[PDB]
Amino acid sequence: MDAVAVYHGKISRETGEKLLLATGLDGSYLLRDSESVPGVYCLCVLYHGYIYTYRVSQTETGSWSAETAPGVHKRYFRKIKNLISAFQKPDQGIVIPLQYPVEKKSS
Amino acid sequence: RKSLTIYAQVQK
């Protein structure tokens, strides 16, 4: 069904920044549309006052995955939301394993 | 300062 409640939609950079800063919880992430690359999502986690943005796009093979630095190995998935459950692995996902979702609906 | 975004990539 692809249920993405963490996708508030399209918001400016200033919006995503204050959005994660409001929660005041390290590890808080959100799903916002890329204001530079259409059809591509962006998962941001607030850490050290700096909002770390990560581009998430589906490969031509149909597998879901995120961008990887030149020299790092990235695993492939079969769902957009599945990326969250797989990224919840400490020292095996991102700067911080997603923990507190910041959706625009209910607190 | 005046910039709360890194736009980095996954280092893991």
Coordinates of C-alpha atoms in Angstrom, one line a residue, chain A residues 1-105:
Chain A
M1 CA 0.0 0.0 0.0
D2 CA 3.0 2.2 0.5
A3 CA 1.9 4.2 3.6
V4 CA 4.2 7.2 4.1
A5 CA 2.8 9.4 6.8
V6 CA 6.2 10.9 7.4
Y7 CA 5.8 12.6 4.0
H8 CA 4.5 16.1 4.8
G9 CA 4.9 16.8 1.1
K10 CA 6.9 19.7 -0.4
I11 CA 8.5 22.2 2.0
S12 CA 11.3 24.8 1.8
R13 CA 14.7 24.2 3.3
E14 CA 13.9 26.7 6.1
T15 CA 10.8 24.6 6.8
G16 CA 12.5 21.3 7.2
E17 CA 15.2 22.9 9.4
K18 CA 12.9 24.4 12.0
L19 CA 10.6 21.4 11.7
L20 CA 13.3 19.0 13.1
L21 CA 14.6 21.7 15.5
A22 CA 11.1 22.1 17.0
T23 CA 10.9 18.4 18.2
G24 CA 14.2 19.0 20.0
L25 CA 15.1 15.3 19.8
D26 CA 18.3 14.0 18.3
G27 CA 17.5 11.4 15.7
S28 CA 14.3 13.1 14.5
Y29 CA 13.8 12.6 10.8
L30 CA 11.2 13.7 8.1
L31 CA 10.4 13.0 4.5
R32 CA 10.3 16.1 2.3
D33 CA 10.3 16.5 -1.5
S34 CA 13.6 17.6 -3.1
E35 CA 13.3 21.3 -4.2
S36 CA 16.1 20.5 -6.7
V37 CA 15.4 17.0 -8.0
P38 CA 11.7 16.2 -8.8
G39 CA 10.5 12.7 -8.1
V40 CA 13.2 12.4 -5.4
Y41 CA 12.7 12.4 -1.6
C42 CA 15.0 13.7 1.1
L43 CA 15.3 12.2 4.6
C44 CA 16.8 14.6 7.1
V45 CA 18.0 13.8 10.7
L46 CA 18.6 16.6 13.1
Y47 CA 22.0 16.2 14.8
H48 CA 24.4 18.7 16.4
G49 CA 22.1 21.5 15.4
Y50 CA 22.9 20.6 11.8
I51 CA 20.2 19.0 9.7
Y52 CA 21.7 16.2 7.7
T53 CA 19.9 15.8 4.4
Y54 CA 20.0 12.5 2.4
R55 CA 18.7 11.9 -1.1
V56 CA 16.5 8.9 -1.6
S57 CA 15.7 7.7 -5.1
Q58 CA 14.6 4.4 -6.6
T59 CA 17.0 2.7 -9.0
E60 CA 16.2 1.7 -12.6
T61 CA 16.1 -1.9 -11.3
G62 CA 13.0 -1.1 -9.2
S63 CA 14.9 -1.4 -6.0
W64 CA 14.8 1.4 -3.4
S65 CA 18.0 2.9 -2.1
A66 CA 19.8 6.1 -1.1
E67 CA 22.8 8.0 -2.3
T68 CA 26.3 6.6 -1.3
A69 CA 29.6 8.4 -0.9
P70 CA 32.5 7.5 -3.3
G71 CA 33.9 4.4 -1.6
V72 CA 30.9 3.3 0.5
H73 CA 28.7 0.2 -0.2
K74 CA 24.9 0.7 -0.1
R75 CA 22.4 -2.1 0.3
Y76 CA 19.3 -2.2 -1.9
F77 CA 15.7 -2.5 -0.6
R78 CA 12.2 -3.2 -2.1
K79 CA 10.2 -0.4 -0.6
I80 CA 10.4 3.3 0.3
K81 CA 9.3 3.0 3.9
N82 CA 11.4 -0.2 4.3
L83 CA 14.4 2.1 4.1
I84 CA 13.4 3.5 7.5
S85 CA 13.3 0.1 9.2
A86 CA 16.6 -0.8 7.7
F87 CA 18.2 2.5 8.6
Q88 CA 17.3 2.0 12.2
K89 CA 20.5 0.1 12.6
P90 CA 23.1 1.9 14.8
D91 CA 26.5 2.3 13.1
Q92 CA 25.0 0.4 10.2
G93 CA 22.7 3.0 8.6
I94 CA 23.2 6.7 8.7
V95 CA 24.6 9.4 11.1
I96 CA 21.8 8.2 13.3
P97 CA 19.3 5.3 13.1
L98 CA 15.9 7.0 12.5
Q99 CA 13.9 7.0 15.8
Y100 CA 11.5 9.9 16.1
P101 CA 9.4 10.7 12.9
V102 CA 8.3 14.3 12.3
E103 CA 5.1 14.0 10.4
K104 CA 2.8 17.0 9.7
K105 CA -0.5 15.8 11.2

